[PDB]
Amino acid sequence: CPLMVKVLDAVRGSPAINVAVHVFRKAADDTWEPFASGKTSESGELHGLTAEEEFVEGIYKVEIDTKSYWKALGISPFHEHAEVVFTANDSGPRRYTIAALLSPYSYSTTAVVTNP
Amino acid sequence: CPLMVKVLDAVRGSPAINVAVHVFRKAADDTWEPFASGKTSESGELHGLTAEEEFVEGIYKVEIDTKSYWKALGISPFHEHAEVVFTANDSGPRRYTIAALLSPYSYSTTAVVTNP
Amino acid sequence: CPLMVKVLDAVRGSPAINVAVHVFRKAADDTWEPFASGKTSESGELHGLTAEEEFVEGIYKVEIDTKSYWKALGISPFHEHAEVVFTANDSGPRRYTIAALLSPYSYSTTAVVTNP
Amino acid sequence: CPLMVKVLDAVRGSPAINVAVHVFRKAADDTWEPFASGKTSESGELHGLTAEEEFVEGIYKVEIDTKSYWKALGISPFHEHAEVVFTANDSGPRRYTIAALLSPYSYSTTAVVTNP
């Protein structure tokens, strides 16, 4: 699975379950073209994002819907969302895990890039 | 100063100097209009950012050019930038600090909202 | 696995490999008693630390030898190490993942605690 | 001020005010000897922790009472405290800021080592 998104909850100290996540790919004309969509699972993971789809070289945007998540939990968050924009597969095929750690007024995002 | 941006470098243990930062307010036709812009100083800070009487209520995106910053030092970072998107001044004026802490493959962002 | 430790390297974007980890449980007399120990694997993980029914209620301290890790890559770090001290299982025994993300001048730690 | 200590709350998005910080130095015999101590202020900062005519080369430990901070707010946190341990002024004179960013189940810490 070459694109994996994992989200944790730093207030509850757990997986962030059912977070909307939309991946996009910057097309040849400089506009973001949908690429994959998802809701995180019981373990805060979102798998098979390139099933049926080519994971080609390019610029990707993983957009995590943190506002909905915190609002569904009765909290008013600071951010509308958490976006992670990066170039994929520029030096060859890689496997990517984007981890997001969440609080209402704060997030962190790391990328684990491993060579297949 | 009602909107400050502050940047640290987690690798070197110091402020992040000369980091380009571009702020945009979302326009009603639902697109991002230039709002202000600048470079962090010697203390990693950016002040006097709000273009005249313009810091109205609205959706803001602060974009930090972290890629140029790591590339100026010879490092090859994960991200193209770090965008922070938030609604500002919807329930009466506050002062906003956007703190960003930077690593080549990771960053962290926090809003410290305080009351006039 | 009821006590697990994940370390990640935020400079390189990968698991932190071969990092020395030492757990301790606080004793009857309020001193720290050697409990388990390990070095993180290829995936930056350290497994079979506790042994389920060997994991009592108490205060544990996970220490991560972050200093050697950075000096073994030719970097000179800030911290001597990173410690994590938590109360374990004071309730209906649960699984603990302690995740640590590393950088020379900074680290961040998170607990994922799940009902088995 | 050769040793500042700044604490932010990532849940509420404000400084963490009134936080108990206790600082130790490792003595000749390798036991932690009390050194300075205090409580963070309206800005979450803790100034006047030490005097440059007294802050000598050695290993310090900066312990921050996150548990009482979270309880005082009705929150059952994960960690007992946040311990930051580090060697100081071994290369001569420098200013140190320990920044800590708190969530009930996570925290991150960065050292900003700047020069006289």
Curated annotation (Swiss-Prot), chains A, B, C, D:
Effect of K26N: In AMYLD1; amyloid polyneuropathy
Annotated GO MF terms: hormone activity; hormone binding; identical protein binding; molecular sequestering activity; protein-containing complex binding
Documented effect of changing F24I: In AMYLD1; Jewish 'SKO' amyloid polyneuropathy
Record localization: Secreted; Cytoplasm
Impact noted for substituting A36T: In AMYLD1; amyloid cardiomyopathy
Entry superkingdom: Eukaryota
Biological role: Thyroid hormone-binding protein. Probably transports thyroxine from the bloodstream to the brain.
This protein's name: Transthyretin
Gene: TTR
Covered residues, full protein: 30 to 145 of 147
